[PDB]
Symmetry: C4
Subunit: 577 residues, 4 copies
């Protein structure tokens, strides 16, 4: 039977679970073709690889398995979105422009080494239009980075003259004459893709952040008494803002479980006010909810764009509050407004170069080290604005006769007569020196205090120059060690453990390639995701004996069916090798 076994290997899934006998058992099932196809994608695999990194730095109890299943049912929704969008001599001479073009081409080549990319007939074409934008959002985003370097290159030719060709900011291309009309065209083209980036993001990403948020609220209402039993935290905004969505008649819109309302009513509705549950949480005419599933479900006629006024205003206010507080969407909103504000005849289009960072991979990796210790790195600066001040009060009333700027016959500028203008001298000029405030201050010689100044300067150079700048240069250096040690620990633990059992490779190496197949052939955290897609797409009357046992525990959110400590070989070691 080698032909059929060879042909059906890609589709024959396999997982090991523990249940129904307190013994580990294997489970076989059919992995669909489309489910297999949607898993081998560049987007999904990176999402999975991101999850593995997160779960292994913050790792604990079955919380890991809770995170795994919560991730397992996120990509399922992500897959649903992805399905519905697809249809010794003298060298030459170098002028400024030539060198500028060469160096800018070098910079752009370095960056690109990232390689980033009637009233009824409109509806069918508009859906294709939005499906088009969502389909290619990264390529269109990468296009903005093109136009951010293109516009800024053109902006690199301005000049200032009091007489127009009250200063006049006139361009001055090499008469190529081309640059000026190009800027008008390129700026208009830029703000278009900046607008299209929002619409592409809105129809592609935020359906996944609404589903994610509605997921936990439904979990914390059914399996917890978030708003029923105890309260929210009264300090957490997110736990408080979503109080507005319970009353809405369409609370579980994106999320699958549209009967989560009736579930909490049966659970907490007895020992609590059965009527009071039915007013905190929608359920208008709780009696009519009983009779809703009695006769039938009449279908209203499609009256889109005509009586589409029937929209949950309260729900939409909730949804906007979730979107407008998103960190990524706000950035995309900020990118657009500056481009819009860039058409105010200005350079503001020079701030769209910073995307260079929140873009390239290695470039943002470096910014992580700076921002890894951002909280601590501010304190050192705060400690450098204390120490410098603490020197001012010492030099304000002992060494006043020195902080002059050598104006002849008159001294209107003594930078220590006033405290405020002395603290400004020690911070602006004292720190930025290389010698401290001994370099920019008269030479103490003879002056009875010429040993109270030498002790004063060298202490200043020692403390607020060498040490308090070897910390800022030392916090960044340690940041790289902190981050690289993380990646080494992530790779090490992933390689020497099964991530589903706890068993190390020492036990799975008594046989050749024992561990290599264990995390590939046996339970390998990828058939498990394929198992849930199998159950949810299979009616309950056909669930086999093992499949319904899992489906029972999954709906109870008890994850005891994962092996976690024993895998079919420690179980059956003595029986057959």
């Amino acid at each position: 039977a080698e032909s059929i076994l060879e042909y059906f290997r890609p589709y024959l899934g396999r997982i090991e679970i523990m249940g129904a006998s307190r013994r580990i058992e294997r489970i076989y099932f059919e992995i669909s073709e489309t489910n297999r196809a949607q898993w081998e994608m560049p987007q999904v695999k990176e999402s999975k690889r991101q999850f593995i990194f997160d779960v292994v730095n913050e790792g604990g109890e079955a919380e890991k398995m809770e995170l795994f299943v919560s991730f397992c049912e996120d990509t399922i929704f992500e897959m649903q979105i992805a399905a519905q969008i697809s249809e010794v001599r003298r060298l030459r001479r170098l002028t400024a422009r030539e060198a500028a073009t060469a160096l800018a081409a070098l910079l752009w080549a370095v960056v690109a080494r990232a390689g980033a990319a009637f009233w009824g007939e409109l509806e069918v074409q508009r859906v294709k239009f939005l499906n088009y934008l969502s389909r290619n959002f990264y390529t269109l985003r990468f296009l903005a980075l093109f136009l951010a370097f293109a516009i800024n290159f053109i902006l690199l030719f301005y000049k200032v003259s009091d007489s127009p060709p009250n200063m006049v900011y006139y361009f001055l291309e090499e008469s190529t004459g081309y640059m000026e009309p190009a800027l008008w065209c390129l700026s208009l083209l830029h703000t278009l893709v900046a607008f299209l980036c929002i619409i592409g993001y809105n129809c592609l990403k935020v359906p996944l952040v609404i589903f994610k948020r509605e997921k936990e609220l439904a979990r914390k209402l059914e399996f917890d008494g978030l708003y029923i039993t105890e309260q929210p935290g009264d300090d957490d905004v997110k736990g408080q803002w979503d109080r507005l969505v319970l009353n809405t008649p369409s609370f579980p819109s994106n999320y699958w479980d549209k009967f989560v309302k009736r579930k909490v009513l049966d659970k907490h509705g007895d020992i609590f006010g059965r009527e009071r549950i039915a007013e905190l949480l929608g359920m208008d005419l709780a009696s009519l909810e009983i009779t809703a599933h009695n006769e039938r479900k009449p279908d209203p006629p499609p009256g889109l764009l005509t009586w589409l006024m029937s929209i949950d205003v309260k729900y939409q206010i909730w949804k906007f509050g979730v979107i407008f507080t998103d960190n990524s969407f706000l950035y995309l909103g900020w990118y657009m407004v500056m481009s819009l504000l860039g058409h105010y005849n200005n350079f503001f289009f020079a701030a769209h170069l910073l995307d260079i960072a929140m873009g390239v991979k290695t470039l943002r990796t470096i910014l992580s080290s700076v921002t890894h210790n951002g909280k601590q790195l501010v304190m050192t600066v705060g400690l450098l604005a204390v120490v410098v001040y603490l020197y001012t009060v010492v030099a304000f009333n002992f060494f006043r006769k020195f902080y002059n700027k050598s104006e002849d016959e008159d001294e209107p500028d003594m930078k220590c007569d006033d405290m405020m203008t002395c603290y400004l001298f020690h911070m602006y000029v004292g720190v930025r020196a290389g010698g401290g405030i001994g370099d920019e201050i008269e030479d103490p010689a003879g002056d009875e205090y010429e040993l109270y100044r030498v002790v004063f300067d060298i202490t200043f150079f020692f403390f607020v120059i060498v040490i308090l700048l070897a910390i800022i240069q030392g916090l960044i250096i340690d940041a790289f060690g902190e981050l690289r040690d993380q990646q080494e620990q992530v790779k090490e633990d992933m390689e020497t453990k099964c991530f589903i059992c706890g068993i190390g490779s020492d036990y799975f190496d008594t046989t050749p390639h024992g561990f290599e197949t264990h995390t590939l052939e046996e339970h390998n955290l990828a058939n498990y995701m394929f198992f849930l897609m199998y159950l949810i797409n299979k009616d309950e009357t056909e669930h086999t004996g093992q499949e319904s046992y899992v489906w029972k525990m999954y709906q109870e959110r008890c994850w005891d069916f994962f092996p976690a400590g024993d895998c079919f070989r420690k179980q059956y070691e003595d029986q057959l090798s």
Copy 2:
């Protein structure tokens, strides 16, 4: 070989055959490994230092123009910020290589209504593109040995 052949063109080109000193000695090439271990990342920081400096030029091109003079008496044919291209060249060639930033080579902001927009301007420049963006280049090499 070609440089040696080209060295018989009556020239010094035979002074480029000293670099074999590196692609030769063991410990010497071991040190060059640390420099070239993070070569890909170490370019990006420089690319990030030619962005930040430019991002300061557009701020000083149209707010602090009256400062970037070189004190020529009775005439000022050299204002290093009247043109963008000759301002970005001033901030990169002279601004970075300083030890104080562009506060050391620029008139002293005093009285000028903008003397607090310059102090915030210089110290931010010294903080960001001098201390931090050169503690990374000096920090990428240190981590390479580890």
Copy 3:
């Protein structure tokens, strides 16, 4: 120096070679000032580790 040989040498301005000097100085400051002194200051730091 702290600037390399651009600090102690006439200012390249106008001179047809004023871009062969700017590339000359900044390369000097980059290579034999920042890098070749972050190694000597980096070999000592690694020694403690």
Copy 4:
């Protein structure tokens, strides 16, 4: 030096019982075996 201390403190505390000497390898043959061992059984807080 200081960060390596904190990493070693968290690591040893997590992989040992602090009252026995037994590591988590023995207390993981059962699901949540170590998690309950340092919570339900002797857990240096009932001792106080």
